Symmetry: D2
């Protein structure tokens, strides 16, 4: 062929070996998406379960995914540092994750909301990015970062929508009322003025959602030395593992991580 | 925050300015997908119509897409060289396209196949890659490359699948019969033994599908010099331009390209 | 070997085919360097000749370099569009150019400055970066950018040092006198206050230095179609072409570029 | 300015934070270089000392370099994992190192070989590449890798050249004699045929050269929390710490590495 040379213009990006990979997916324009389909505000319970169902399905399909954290319209997936899925090609990994979440979300949406058929100009789409982390302390810090943001965003939105719904404020006056406020202020506004105790909100709303792969007889046998069938049996054992869902603090509960050593290696 | 530092590990890739971008999407495991959902062989008309509807819909949402070419389970989209969609971020462009094609396919499938509901373990997924080409001659050669591949593959599958169904050969025997064969050989087997004239095959099957944006009073006004209201008005005309579908040779027809100068600019 | 695996952590960057490469080199910490060895101000003639000699020697060794532009402590080298030097590896190209410039400068320094032996803590070091340009119009604009930069800095330095040297102003007052001034203002300060006609300054100081590869019987014979020994013959011809130095405008003189079409190929 | 837009085509590459950086420099065409200047064989003592001085000089100016290893025409530099030199820009780091090693070599060459002035067509040039390693075990294995290669090449070259110089063999007969041989065969050839004990070779020749930053009162005082003035005092101590040279096994002497914990941080 006189034309096949054009293949030489392609550039693959192989992610640095032996590094933890985070794949973060985030809904595109989900403010508009959540408005169009009338999410309950501040939080739509069934909408989050769709995200979570989507995430668990993806995670059960790919044994390299060790840990998942989701809230709002985002999910973060931790791939083990020795992951060889698609030879660690960033193009493959990211475009497959954004494709899967889109389609899994679309599938499960038709299950949970049969009376809200999707409009062609409002299908659920997601982006995806890969981030490399060379040390597990950065992994701890990454998920702590994301859970802290969930708290802040959930506290704000719960406060915001209660100002609108309980006090019959317009969005603009709700926003202005909150400018200049810290976490303790919003809590006071919610309790004293709206009659809502934030601490009594659902654990899923306050903490977000953790989906983690659970192993029973784990020994830190995973090493560079052993290979071939050992790797393949380990691939099989990872596939035949169980997914558990939690709504807990992972920021300050160090024992939670320590009792799950397969996350680091 | 003591954790937000983790954002610094993210790495963006901004694609070289003033260069043509090709985004190519390809179905994940569509051999299996086409078997599970019982596609007609060698070509399933409605399946391609699902593909064609998706790409046209995608292309109509994004005025920077000037031209698209599809055959089998793939589509290639040409972005104009001064495209600023998502600031030419490689991650954004590819994960958006893979997500869009995925959901549009899923949407249109339910239109064309109400009697074949999608199964959760067989959803339509796509990869997506971006390729840069610094000269339009490479764009012509790229699409020539894909259409030639369309010709070769359709001929093989038409010959292959007529050998199994008409001559009652097994898969191995048809493949074995074809080992060592060129186009004229395949063409003769079709004519003389199977009683099929390849030239009488649908133009879409032979040539594939081209979706192109058409302009009527085009002048090469596009230059770096004019700006402000000038550019946004042309952006408005690009969205309000028409997409026409063709099943024609674009390999050897220079006049086809020459009469479409907006492809170059 | 159980340790040779570490080679797999290396990541090569192959620069996009069929694109103009600009390699720009700029002296590291040459302000201090020029002070340490007591360079003449604003311009040291023998100092610029060391740079030009270094660059020309480099350019005569690497036939892929079609054009070079230098001023101050910098040189830019244009690599032909179809350059395959080190397989277009960015690492090889840039670290080779910075090393070459550093040692050639050092060699020629000992030629031009026998009376100023180099001190180990003040050796001439250079960085180097590669930049891709998909269209020759950006190459024209690149060199225009640099020559304008040359004019601006030379005009400033000539004005600055005439304020210090003729009018016995302090550096601080010379610097404060010029803040907020455009070219017409600086020209007058030189004329009315310093009695200097800027146009009588050396052409090299005003315009910088262009080193160009010159061909006599050139025909645009270059195409993908011609190959094998034909390309090898074109390499010998390119290696053995004459290098000419100019101190002229290249910003506005379109005819200068048009009569040297091999730069575009 | 209408031409300054061309700056936007530049692409920086910021190396992953919190990862070990190895920089390896290697002499360009040093086979030919060592012939032209008539190096002693197998090992030229003064030529290696030129290399060692360059590396030691380079290392004393840049305190982020924690360890260096050299043999033949190569030197590898370990940058501490929290290095912020040039904001971890790969282009700056590599072209600085290739320039520095080249000029330091040229400088020190004139000190050790006043009687062998450098010819302009045979100056000492170096390439340079940055390699990332996410775990310190790879740093150990890297230097193990390079020292093993030094052993292999020095044992071979010493045996080879003793065959040529002592037994008056031609290069070709010496080469075939060594084809198919492991270390014990080569050692025996040295012992039984040439009367040379390899173990009595200089430690520098056998092991290469290790340059290490030595700390006396080191505690792993480095953490993310400590910053500002703590870091500036720490930077000053690293700069004014002492460089010690060793010619010892670092492959298998774990206690050697273990007693130097500042290497991991
Ligand atoms: N010339 C050339 N063509 C290739 C190469 N690899 C794949 N192709 C062809 O390019 C077409 C596009 O398919 P791709 O999906 O991009 O190629 P692939 O083999 O699937 O590689 P990946 O999908 O990236 O894993 C296919 O029909 C392949 O036959 C290659 O390395 N060189
Ligand atoms: N009502 C409601 N809205 C939600 C819920 N989850 C996510 N959202 C919407 O998603 C948004 C999350 O913010 P972002 O993801 O950062 O912004 P975005 O609108 O998705 O736009 P992008 O930057 O393109 O991702 C919120 O502002 C909400 O409007 C939910 O459970 N209920
Ligand atoms: N520290 C820091 N955090 C940011 C920055 N930009 C966004 N974030 C936060 O990071 C979270 C992840 O959102 P992203 O999708 O990565 O950022 P974005 O603003 O949507 O920008 P995109 O990359 O185009 O999607 C957001 O909810 C923001 O709160 C930033 O520049 N610095
Ligand atoms: N029978 C039939 N098969 C089709 C049709 N369209 C696509 N296919 C199948 O899709 C395949 C296209 O090849 P690829 O996309 O390169 O292979 P793949 O199964 O998608 O595997 P990947 O490389 O992961 O994409 C063909 O082998 C066909 O079997 C169709 O209209 N009819
Ligand atoms: N295991 C392995 N070793 C290699 C490979 N390529 C080169 N090496 C070795 O690595 C050592 C370092 O040499 P380098 O200069 O980095 O590699 P090179 O052969 O010179 O190639 P370049 O320098 O990139 O032009 C050499 O002695 C090579 O034998 C490889 O692909 N795999
Ligand atoms: N006296 C004199 N000084 C010169 C001459 N050429 C270059 N220089 C000095 O070199 C400087 C070049 O500035 P830059 O290259 O932008 O900065 P730098 O000092 O080289 O250091 P970097 O920013 O790291 O590149 C000028 O300001 C002068 O001080 C010369 O011909 N004569
Ligand atoms: N328009 C524009 N000009 C720049 C920019 N950065 C630097 N310049 C100017 O362009 C000239 C090119 O020199 P550079 O070496 O690329 O600039 P620099 O600041 O030294 O950048 P680094 O050496 O990479 O740190 C410099 O003298 C700057 O004055 C920029 O981001 N935009
Ligand atoms: N006689 C002698 N030769 C040496 C000495 N040190 C290095 N060399 C020469 O340097 C060469 C090193 O090989 P390489 O670095 O892989 O190849 P190169 O000649 O530098 O060329 P490149 O691969 O482009 O870097 C050896 O083959 C030797 O001939 C020395 O101490 N004495
Ligand atoms: Mg976002
Ligand atoms: Mg979002
Ligand atoms: Mg979000
Ligand atoms: Mg493929
Ligand atoms: Mg496919
Ligand atoms: Mg395909
Ligand atoms: Mg600079
Ligand atoms: Mg400089
Ligand atoms: Mg400069
Ligand atoms: Mg090499
Ligand atoms: Mg070498
Ligand atoms: Mg070497």
């Amino acid at each position: 062929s006189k034309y096949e040379y054009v293949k030489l213009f392609e550039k693959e990006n192989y992610l640095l070996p032996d590094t933890y990979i985070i794949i973060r997916v985030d809904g595109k324009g989900f403010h508009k998406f959540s408005q169009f389909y009338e999410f309950e505000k501040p939080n739509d319970l069934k909408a989050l379960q769709v995200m979570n169902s989507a995430a668990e399905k993806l995670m059960s399909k790919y044994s390299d995914v060790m840990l998942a954290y989701g809230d709002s319209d985002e999910y973060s997936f931790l791939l083990r540092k020795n992951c060889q899925l698609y030879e660690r090609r960033e193009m493959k990994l990211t475009t497959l994750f954004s494709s899967l979440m889109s389609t899994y979300y679309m599938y499960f949406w038709s299950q949970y909301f049969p009376d809200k058929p999707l409009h062609i100009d409002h299908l659920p789409n997601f982006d995806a990015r890969a981030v490399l982390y060379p040390d597990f302390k950065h992994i701890r810090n990454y998920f702590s970062w994301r859970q802290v943001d969930c708290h802040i965003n959930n506290l704000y939105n719960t406060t915001f929508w209660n100002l609108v719904l309980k006090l019959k404020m317009t969005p603009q006056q709700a926003e202005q009322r909150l400018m200049g406020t810290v976490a303790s202020d919003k809590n006071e506004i919610l309790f004293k003025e709206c009659g809502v105790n934030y601490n009594n909100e659902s654990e899923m709303y306050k903490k977000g959602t953790i989906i983690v792969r659970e192993f029973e007889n784990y020994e830190t046998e995973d090493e560079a030395e052993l290979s071939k069938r050992q790797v393949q049996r380990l691939e099989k054992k990872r596939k035949k593992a169980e997914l558990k869902i939690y709504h807990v603090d992972i920021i300050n509960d160090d024992s939670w991580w320590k009792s799950r050593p397969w996350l680091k290696d």
